[PDB]
Subunit: 205 residues, 2 copies
Amino acid sequence: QGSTSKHEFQAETKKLLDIVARSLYSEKEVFIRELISNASDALEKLRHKLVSDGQALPEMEIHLQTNAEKGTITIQDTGIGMTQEELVSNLGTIARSGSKAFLDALQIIGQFGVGFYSAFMVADRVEVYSRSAAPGSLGYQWLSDGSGVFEIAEASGVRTGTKIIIHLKSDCKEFSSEARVRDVVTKYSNFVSFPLYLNGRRMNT
Amino acid sequence: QGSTSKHEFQAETKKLLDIVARSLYSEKEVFIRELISNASDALEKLRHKLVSDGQALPEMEIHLQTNAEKGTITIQDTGIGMTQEELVSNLGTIARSGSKAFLDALQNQFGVGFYSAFMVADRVEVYSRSAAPGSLGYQWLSDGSGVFEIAEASGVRTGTKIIIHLKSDCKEFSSEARVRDVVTKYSNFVSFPLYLNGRRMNT
């Protein structure tokens, strides 16, 4: 008996499920590199702007924190930040771009590319605070709480730049342990052009 | 309310693989580019050998035929050919290496990309005779059962001829009109004259 080509293509791609999914799951600490890379790029966008306008530089640092009791990990930078519209458009787009992100990992406007989908893979809840570096900017929070619906709101006491808080999934709590995250962030912090701290400690030369 | 990361990775992977199955299916005509590329490489292997031994070249051409009555598409080259042992090892390996071929496509005579032919075929027949003096012809057969067959085949000419008996949803590749467009485009990319049903397709 002959099978159809259509059916065969379905069967052959399904054969990859376990290999691909196990591989990506075992690598899921990549969200830390992605968000550190994004932070550094945002810092450099601001640095470039200021230097080019002859303006003194503020504190320019990347800060991560882990909180084992809350099961969170936070990444903050004091870089160029995002406007309310940029938050909404960028983070919405990434949250709808899962299959693109997965294909990209195997092979947009704002701080984040499709790779930021790695953060959603490990999160029950994602909070992104940002205040654009343009003078007089207000701070905003964009929130995914794991329902189908995102929320945007003014958030005062947000400092210029961007702060991401991830509440980790039930099988991802290791990323709220300093010990686990130290080795990941020690290696990756070699590759940024700014000072990087983890829980108040300097991680790169 | 919350899902596990493990469950999410499984689901996202499954969703992507379904999108990929559909897009690969839509692109399946790729087997023709793979066959042609393989044909041209075998010709160049023989050409290099003859040139480096100071021998005048024979006619060196890539021929495709389509047969709409029989639902087949055929490709033939007069290149370096394969031995019996090469046929058996190379084609068996490729037939068993579908997941490698697909993972290669996913991540971006024959390599695993030849699997693209198996994807459109009920039956694949490969006839080859090595360009070495004294070589006999053989045929390797996959009939879509679990089992392959190798047999001596006389009157096989030096080189390699592949006959694909197309699947029920693939019969368009036995139509000259449909193969003509594909083959006109791809024949730009080979260093030999390419013919379809006796007609030259490239400059």
